[PDB]
């Protein structure tokens, strides 16, 4: 049976080729996760169809209805067989699906517009002139809410009370906010996205400071899936053989623009 | 039955306390992995016994005999229930035991004597006056042997043919060699150990450059063990709650001897 892969349209993980109207099926798309899906399938010996997650979401359980959205939802309700995407390995997700070991590492990080006199989280925490914030909901916002670290706690109390709101609706809005705010806004987002944008025109942003936490992206299959074991071994082999590092370099830097 | 934990005496992971003689059982020991064991056990609801791996090894399969040694071996052959140690998640190990998601990230990194004019692997590869090497067997050596990366290929060829030998038998030997070599020896080792040593007296070494690869330490259980599921969930909760970062900072930096 053909394996149904769910993934998400987000550069540079999955894009539609410029000539996509000339192509069919899996060949319409390109990117990091497109290449990885190919390697995973080759190493596990399956045929697959790439599909884009219906609701454009990653995977969250609605606190009221208990329903899972996004790619995780597509796995647990049987719409797809495997998710290959920048999907963070988290406890609540691990409880309902299986994750491979991580294929990429990342953490919360600071994006500034080039020129901004900020080099770290401590720098942000001790001032208020350069506003800074996060997505208006999600794990990053929650990281700050629950932090007991002095710097991060100070950043959190600043963010919640700051006027006007320092929170944004989408990461795209956050990046745009940095870019148009004339050095007066910094945005807190995944290091992977931060590092990618730094290599996109007009090359006006920069990742600064170390990551504030650590996590990884993992390939997700449903509990008891016949694919889980082989997929996991595949990730480790690709890492050990240098392929994941080669793939990140390809999509972030060789194809960079700055 | 009380869970049998196997681990290895390696600082700052597991250390005998200075007054260990006045103590008994698990209380004899301290370190990152001792703290981690307590938190894993707490969240999973089991009591445990910390035991030290009999043969002093991590886990490799002999090519000829095909026996697994070290902590992996103790799990594979049923001598221990769980391994909690700086044990790298690797493909060959993953095939014979179960691993939690990683509790610590790391990679191959360069240690220099403070003052050595070297910032990267590429720097090392382009010259010979500063000799450089690694453990004389194991994954870091094999990483270089098999690499297709031009720079690492060049370093492997250099290392294999360099005289006198640039390899060392142990980590301690490697560190001692860097420190006593007046800047003419650099040592390739795990970033985690590199970072630790930089915070130890006499504060005469430093980590330089990015890591050359990426991997993680994982909590290991025998394949199919009922402990695997809860232990993995525990690791994830501890990471997301900030505890793993807290333990790292505690043992590497709060207890560091070279200051901020
Ligand atoms: O850091 C956040 O606050 C955040 C909020 C979201 O709504 C989505 C994400 C995505 C981006 C890709 N990986 C995350 C994931 O897999 O869930 C991150
Ligand atoms: O970097 C090496 O080449 C290397 C060689 C070894 O013989 C042992 C180790 C240990 C140290 C802790 N983690 C590794 C592990 O889990 O195997 C590392």
UniProtKB/Swiss-Prot annotation, chain B:
Comment field on protein domains: The M4 transmembrane segment mediates tetramerization and is required for cell surface expression.
Organism of this sequence: Rattus norvegicus
Disulfide bonds: 203-258
Subcellular location: Cell membrane; Postsynaptic cell membrane; Postsynaptic density membrane
Description of how the protein assembles with itself and partners: Homotetramer or heterotetramer of pore-forming glutamate receptor subunits. Tetramers may be formed by the dimerization of dimers. May interact with MPP4. Forms a ternary complex with GRIP1 and CSPG4. Interacts with ATAD1 in an ATP-dependent manner. ATAD1-catalyzed ATP hydrolysis disrupts binding to ATAD1 and to GRIP1 and leads to AMPAR complex disassembly. Interacts with GRIP2. Interacts with GRIP1. Interacts with NSF via its C-terminus. Interacts with CACNG2, PICK1 and GRIP2. Interacts with GRIA1 and SYNDIG1. Part of a complex containing GRIA2, NSF and NAPA and/or NAPB.
Family designation: Belongs to the glutamate-gated ion channel (TC 1.A.10.1) family. GRIA2 subfamily.
Site (Interaction with the cone snail toxin Con-ikot-ikot) residue list: 61, 145, 237
Post-translational modification: Palmitoylated. Depalmitoylated upon L-glutamate stimulation. Ubiquitinated by RNF167, leading to its degradation.
Function comment: Ionotropic glutamate receptor that functions as a ligand-gated cation channel, gated by L-glutamate and glutamatergic agonists such as alpha-amino-3-hydroxy-5-methyl-4-isoxazolepropionic acid (AMPA), quisqualic acid, and kainic acid. L-glutamate acts as an excitatory neurotransmitter at many synapses in the central nervous system and plays an important role in fast excitatory synaptic transmission.
Membrane-side (Extracellular) residue stretches: 117-260
Range of the intact protein held here: 414 to 796 of 883
Miscellaneous: The postsynaptic actions of L-glutamate are mediated by a variety of receptors that are named according to their selective agonists. This receptor binds AMPA (quisqualate) > L-glutamate > kainate.
Binding of L-glutamate, residues: 86, 88, 93, 139-140, 190
Modified residues (Phosphoserine): 147, 181
Record-marked site positions (Crucial to convey clamshell closure to channel opening): 118
Induction (record text): Down-regulated in the pyramidal cell layer of CA1 in the hippocampus by global ischemia.
Tissue-specific expression: Detected in forebrain. Detected in dendrites of neuronal cells. Expressed in the pyramidal cell layers of CA1 and CA3 and in the granule cell layer of the dentate gyrus.
The protein's name: Glutamate receptor 2
Gene: Gria2
């Amino acid at each position: 049976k053909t394996v149904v892969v769910t993934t998400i349209l987000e550069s540079p993980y999955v894009m539609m080729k410029k000539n996509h109207e000339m192509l069919e099926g899996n060949e319409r798309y390109e990117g990091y996760c497109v290449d990885l899906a190919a390697e995973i399938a080759k190493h596990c010996g399956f045929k697959y169809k790439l599909t884009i997650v219906g609701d454009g979401k990653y995977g969250a359980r609605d606190a009221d209805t208990k329903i899972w959205n996004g790619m995780v939802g597509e796995l647990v309700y049987g719409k797809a067989d495997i998710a290959i995407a920048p999907l963070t390995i988290t406890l609540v997700r691990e409880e309902v699906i299986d994750f491979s070991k991580p294929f990429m590492s990342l953490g919360i990080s600071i994006m500034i517009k080039k020129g901004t006199p900020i080099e770290s989280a401590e720098d942000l925490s001790k001032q208020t002139e350069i506003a800074y914030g996060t997505l208006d909901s999600g794990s990053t916002k929650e990281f700050f809410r629950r932090s007991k670290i002095a710097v991060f706690d100070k950043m959190w109390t600043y963010m919640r009370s700051a006027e006007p709101s320092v929170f944004v609706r989408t990461t795209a809005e956050g990046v745009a906010r940095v870019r148009k705010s004339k050095g007066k806004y910094a945005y807190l987002l995944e290091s992977t996205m931060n590092e990618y944008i730094e290599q996109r025109k007009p090359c006006d942003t920069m990742k600064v400071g170390g990551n504030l936490d650590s996590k990884g992206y993992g390939i997700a299959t449903p509990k008891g899936s016949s694919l889980g074991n082989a997929v996991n071994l595949a990730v480790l082999k690709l890492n050990e053989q240098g392929l994941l590092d080669k793939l990140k370099n390809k999509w972030w830097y060789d194809k960079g623009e700055c």
